[PDB]
A paper describes a structure:
Nucleocytoplasmic transport across the nuclear envelope is controlled and facilitated by nuclear pore complexes (NPCs), very large, modular protein assemblies. The Nic96 complex organizes four architectural proteins, Nic96, Nup157/170, Nup188, and Nup192, as well as the more disordered protein Nup53/59. Nup188 is a stacked helical protein with intrinsic flexibility. Moreover, we can show that both Nup188 and Nup192 specifically bind to FG-repeats and translocate across NPCs by facilitated diffusion.
The C-terminal fragment (Nup188C) includes residues 1445–1827, and we solved its structure to 3.0 Å resolution. Nup188C crystallized in space group P212121 with two copies per asymmetric unit. The C-terminal fragment of Nup188, Nup188C, is a right-handed arc-shaped superhelical structure built from 19 helices that form 6 helical repeats, which are stacked in regular order. The first helical pair (α1 and α2) forms a HEAT repeat followed by 5 ARM repeats. The inner face of the structure is built from helices α2, α5, α8, α12, α15, and α19. The C-terminal helix α19 caps the structure. At the N terminus, helices α1 and α2 expose a hydrophobic surface, which strongly suggests that the full-length protein continues in a stacked pattern. This hydrophobic surface engages in a twofold symmetric crystal packing contact with a neighboring Nup188C molecule resulting in a horseshoe-shaped dimer. Because this contact is generated by a protein truncation, we suggest that it is a crystal artifact and not physiologically relevant. Interestingly, the two Nup188C copies in the asymmetrical unit have a different curvature, likely reflecting the intrinsic flexibility of the molecule.
Author numbering: 1445 to 1494, 1510 to 1533, 1538 to 1704, 1721 to 1823
């Protein structure tokens, strides 16, 4: 064989190279494996075709197998190794040609332990991360979340009672404490919010891939066991005049909840199965949204980036059809503008 000239031949060579590594995650050569995975991630993101069999071969031999090993708390491995694996999964599922072979992924995943152990890890988190924050809590859900974008795998989680494990977990008591907020001096509460906003809620939006005829009483019951959050989500976006700033995640949380409560309501009018009502004042949200839409100046002043990624497109700019000055504002505008459409 010659040198790789195609992006697919590069993918073959990198993947052929990953399998060659005798003992991954071993104290010696764990660091070399770490950058191989990073090379894989670059190539996979590079697969915009700017071939699909390799990606499916990668999902078993690389992604599934590695997570199985990551339950090692005996070993030079870190949370960021899991995050790297979660990342490689995203790159795989973004490649053109995938999403037609979802049962394939379902097949591949279910073969290993995976979501069973991913769920296990979620119920573990606090005993395994009270350095300050349940770091493995968010990592587990984000793994599940990425998979839940595939409707078939979404059905498996609910059938295996993921929503049951979510509320029964020890974590459910920490998220329930009234200190959970994106702007906390506490590391735990800050991660608790991350698990709920960036994990639980987008999970629920996807689990309703089974049309919400079923699971709707279960998704409504999940939300119903975090009322301090349903209450906080509205108060956080309150027009200026115990909250100083406003985050982008706060807008997506409310965006998620607005979709859930509306879809649930369009399923409650079915009058055919008991879908519990969820206490979430839509009225306050709408008004809060309008008095942030009509004030781009006071918006960009109070709006703060929380992630190094979000800060990138904060100092950036994207005018086009201009109602915003910076790109971060545009994304901020985009979110709460959709919340207006939904609740209407």
């Amino acid at each position: 064989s010659l040198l790789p000239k195609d992006i697919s031949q590069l993918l073959s060579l990198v993947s052929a190279t990953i399998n060659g590594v005798d003992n991954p995650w071993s104290k010696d050569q764990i660091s070399y494996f770490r950058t191989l995975l990073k090379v894989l991630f670059v190539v996979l993101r590079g697969t915009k075709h700017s071939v699909t069999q390799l990606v499916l071969t990668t999902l078993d031999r690389v992604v599934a197998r590695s997570f199985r090993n990551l339950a090692a708390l005996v070993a030079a491995t870190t949370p960021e190794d899991l995050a790297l694996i979660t990342a490689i999964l995203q790159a795989c599922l973004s490649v053109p040609g995938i999403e037609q072979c979802q049962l394939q992924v379902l097949n591949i995943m279910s073969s290993h332990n995976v979501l069973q152990v991913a769920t296990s890890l979620f119920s573990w988190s606090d005993r395994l991360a009270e350095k300050g924050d349940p770091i493995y809590g968010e990592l587990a859900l984000l793994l599940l979340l990425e998979l839940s974008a595939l409707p078939a795998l979404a059905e498996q989680l609910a059938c295996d009672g993921l929503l049951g494990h979510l509320t029964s977990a020890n974590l459910a008591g920490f998220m329930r404490r009234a200190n959970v907020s994106p702007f906390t001096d506490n590391a735990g509460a800050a991660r608790c919010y991350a698990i709920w906003a960036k994990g639980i809620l987008p999970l629920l939006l996807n689990i309703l891939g089974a049309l919400g005829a079923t699971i709707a009483p279960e998704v409504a019951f999940v939300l119903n066991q975090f009322p301090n959050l349903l209450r906080s989500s509205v108060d956080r976006l309150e027009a200026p005049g115990p909250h100083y700033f406003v985050a982008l995640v706060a807008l997506s949380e409310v965006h998620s909840l607005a979709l859930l409560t509306r879809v649930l309501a369009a399923l409650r009018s079915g009058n055919a199965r008991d879908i519990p009502e969820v206490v979430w004042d839509s009225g306050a949200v709408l008004e809060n949204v309008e008095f942030w839409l009509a004030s781009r100046k006071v918006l960009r002043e109070r709006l703060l980036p929380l992630n190094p990624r979000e800060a990138e497109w904060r100092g950036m700019k994207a005018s086009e059809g201009s109602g915003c000055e910076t790109k971060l504002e545009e994304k901020a505008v985009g979110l709460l503008e959709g919340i207006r459409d939904v609740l209407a």
